[PDB]
Amino acid sequence: NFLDFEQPIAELEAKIDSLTAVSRQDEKLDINIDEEVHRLREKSVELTRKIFADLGAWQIAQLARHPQRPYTLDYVRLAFDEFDELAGDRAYADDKAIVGGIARLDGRPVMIIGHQKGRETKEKIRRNFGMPAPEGYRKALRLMQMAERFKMPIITFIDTPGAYPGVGAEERGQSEAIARNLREMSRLGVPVVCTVIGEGGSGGALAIGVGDKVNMLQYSTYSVISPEGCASILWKSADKAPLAAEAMGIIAPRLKELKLIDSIIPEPLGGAHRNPEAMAASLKAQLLADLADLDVLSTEDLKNRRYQRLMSYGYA
Amino acid sequence: NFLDFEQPIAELEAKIDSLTAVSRQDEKLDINIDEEVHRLREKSVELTRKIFADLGAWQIAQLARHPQRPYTLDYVRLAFDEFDELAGDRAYADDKAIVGGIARLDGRPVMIIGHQKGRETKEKIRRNFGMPAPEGYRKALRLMQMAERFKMPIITFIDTPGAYPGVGAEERGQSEAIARNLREMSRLGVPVVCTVIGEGGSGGALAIGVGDKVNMLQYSTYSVISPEGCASILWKSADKAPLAAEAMGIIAPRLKELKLIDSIIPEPLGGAHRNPEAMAASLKAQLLADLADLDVLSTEDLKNRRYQRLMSYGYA
């Protein structure tokens, strides 16, 4: 299901599908499929550049929410192996809006923590649209401590609309849990790398994003507040979300100059959704490179550097 | 237009035709034409043997009258070159039921006399269904004399239902003209070869068929009277034509044993009409072979042999 501005790409795709049927549909129909396929694929490839060259911040947000995209499960599958999912906070529940586990990266063992919006409606409602109740963040703290204890690096993916705004979420110390998370992660003796795949932000995202390095795709928005919220509070409306997106600076290159993120991982054309494997390979390369130049530093120097980088936050 | 017993061959042909259309008809239709063409041609080739193995004398007559077949024009075109058509009896008209001319056979010059039924209805009525009025036979005598004079061999084809049974034909000495023809041809000083391509007989055919050699296709009937006439006079009916054909002995092999014809030229499968070129090549080879072993004999010995062979006619 392509977005509104990806229409010319769609109709060309719509002609492309029935090519399979015409191959063996009925009445002996087996036409010269290869010629038409090649011409239509050429046109489609040419047109996507005609479509994805002129997208800006409001679009970037739409693309960051494309309802066909790799979630943390997808990146785990397409760049990680021997994945073991640990579920359980030890207190009140395991949460489906966060998925964590311990896996191997090119032999090396790692910890993977991140969100999972679910693909279709069913897995979206079963995972609460990637909105974690605090018990999830307590689980994430528990896993992060486990990873710290056994001299293990931590790889974290961040793809959350935000911490759930609900009765159950507020009752259980949402603020307290996120505060603790932000406290412990800033003392681990192991390197930390955190991407911004997909749509993330709204503070709750930061619960698992305080690390040595930070990386973001080219169509991923990292906003202290969703554009619609900023629009409602400030613009006194919702339709004016694109203006809020333009003003805030939620796009990766805008953030990059702000010394906030350490690298942008380029996407396959038309969005990572068109070539999830290519995006997974790019992410794996970026993660490995980040880990490499990180392992040289010792644990004490690692923590000191982490603290120093934090203090660089804010123009002050 | 195939005959009644060639139906299974037809329907398979009927499926075969629209293969051309399906190649580029509409809606991008270009199917794997070669596979279906090969399979259907295999089936058609197998079926014709299933159809032309079990034909007998009544059929042979039907095949001899297949309304798709090479007439003398066709054999001239497909086995002769530098053909010049002489038309004119010098007396009252040139006739379209006979076509004569002087042409070359592999360099050698020859004379070609024979009938031409015309292909479609128009050329059939314009040529009087290959039925010659006597002026035609006078023309044939004139040409035969011309060929004799200039030491030239004569090749004759014979494809006639018969001499026209009409007022104009009877008035002009039909009997006289044919008698003269039968007289002169038995004195020419040049070799004579005469086939029985197509349907011929009824005496008038003999007007141009008294030569050193005689040859007949495998599906050509040479009857002193059409089967239908024999049926009407003797059987007292018309439907009983096949019995008349069986009794008379109008089929080539039946005649061959009678010492009446000197050779049968085998046909392409399914009738010469399916491969007119192959039939033309076979006819040309037979004609050349006949001429070869004939030119050895001198003119006097040629005429003496011709006379002796004639006397062998009839068991007496």
Give the three-state DSSP class for A94.
coil
Give the three-state DSSP class for B109.
strand
**Do residues B204 and B227 make contact, with C-beta atoms less than 8 angstroms apart?**
no
Q: Report residue B129 CA to chain centroid gap.
A: 13
User: What is the rounded CA–CA span in Å between residue B138 and residue B100?
Assistant: 12
| Residue found under tokens 């002995």 | B249
Chain B positions touching A36 (Cβ under 8 A) are 28
Chain A positions touching B36 (Cβ under 8 A) are 28
**Contact call for B30 and A31, based on CB within 8 A:** yes
User: What is the rounded CA–CA span in Å between residue A114 and residue B278?
Assistant: 81
Residue A199 has φ and ψ, to the nearest 5°, of -95, 125
User: What is the rounded CA–CA span in Å between residue A204 and residue A224?
Assistant: 9
In this structure, the number of other CB atoms found within 10 A of the CB of residue A252 comes to 22
CA dihedral A238, A242, A248, A250 (to 10 degrees): 120
DSSP state of B234: I
Q: What six digits make up the tokens of A167?
A: 């009765």
CA dihedral A272, A278, A279, A280 (to 10 degrees): 140
| Residue found under tokens 């209805």 | B121
Residue B84 has φ and ψ, to the nearest 5°, of -120, 120
Residue type, B204: G
Kindly calculate the radius of gyration of chain B based on its CA atoms and give it in whole angstroms: 21
Give the three-state DSSP class for B182.
helix
DSSP state of B83: E
Q: Which of B258, B247, B178 is nearest to B214 (CA)?
A: B258
Whole-angstrom CA distances from A127 to A1, A84, A94, A131, B278 are 21, 19, 11, 7, 80
Chain A positions touching B31 (Cβ under 8 A) are 28-31
Element at A254 (helix H, strand E):
helix A252-257
Per-residue three-class SS string for A108-156: EEEEEEEECCCCCHHHHHHCHHHCCCHHHHHHHHHHHHHHHHCCCCEEE
Per-residue three-class SS string for B128-140: HHHCCCHHHHHHH
Query: What resolution in angstroms does the PDB record give?
Result: 4.0
User: What is the rounded CA–CA span in Å between residue B181 and residue B142?
Assistant: 9
User: What is the rounded CA–CA span in Å between residue B305 and residue A195?
Assistant: 112
Question: What phi-psi label fits residue B237: left (phi over 0), alpha (psi between -120 and 50 degrees) or beta?
Answer: beta
User: What is the rounded CA–CA span in Å between residue B102 and residue B114?
Assistant: 12
B30 in reach of chain A (CB within 8 A)? yes
Q: What six digits make up the tokens of B97?
A: 């039921």
Give the three-state DSSP class for A81.
strand
Experimental technique of record: cryo-EM
User: What is the rounded CA–CA span in Å between residue A112 and residue A74?
Assistant: 12
**Do residues A141 and A181 make contact, with C-beta atoms less than 8 angstroms apart?**
yes
How are strands ordered across the β-sheet holding B213-217? B81-85, B98-105, B108-115, B154-156, B192-194, B213-217, B263-265
DSSP state of B4: G
Kindly calculate the radius of gyration of chain A based on its CA atoms and give it in whole angstroms: 21
| Residue A257: burial class (beta carbons within 10 Å; 0-12, 13-18, 19+) | exposed
A29 in reach of chain B (CB within 8 A)? yes
List beta partners, residue B110. Answer: B103
Among A23, A32, A37, the strongest candidate for a mutation testing the B interface, having the largest count of B CBs within 10 A, is A32
**Contact call for A36 and B28, based on CB within 8 A:** yes
Chain A positions touching B29 (Cβ under 8 A) are 29, 31
Who contacts A204 (Cβ-Cβ below 8 Å, separation ≥6)?
A132, A137, A160, A162, A163, A178
- Characterize the bridge pairing of strands B98-105 and B108-115: antiparallel
**Do residues A129 and A122 make contact, with C-beta atoms less than 8 angstroms apart?**
no
Tell me the CB-side half-sphere exposure of residue A116, using CA atoms within 13 A.
23
Q: Which of A48, A26, A23, A50 is nearest to A37 (CA)?
A: A23
Q: What six digits make up the tokens of A316?
A: 């002050």
User: What is the rounded CA–CA span in Å between residue A36 and residue A15?
Assistant: 10
Who contacts A239 (Cβ-Cβ below 8 Å, separation ≥6)?
A231
A28 in reach of chain B (CB within 8 A)? yes
DSSP for A5-68?
A: GGHHHHHHHHHHHHHHHHHHSSTT----HHHHHHHHHHHHHHHHHHHHSS--HHHHHHHHT-SS
Helices marked H in chain B — which ranges?
7-24, 33-52, 57-64, 72-79, 121-126, 134-149, 167-171, 174-184, 227-230, 241-248, 252-257, 276-295, 299-311
Element at A311 (helix H, strand E):
helix A299-311
Q: How big is the A-B interface in CB pairs under 8 Å?
A: 14
Among A30, A36, A39, the strongest candidate for a mutation testing the B interface, having the largest count of B CBs within 10 A, is A30
Exposure string over A173-183, b if 16+ CB within 10 A, otherwise e: ebeebbebbbe
Q: Which of B186, B214, B199, B193 is nearest to B79 (CA)?
A: B193
User: What is the rounded CA–CA span in Å between residue B56 and residue B54?
Assistant: 7
Per-residue three-class SS string for A196-243: CCCCEECCHHHHHCCCCEEEEECCCCEECCCHHHHHHHHHCCCCCHHH
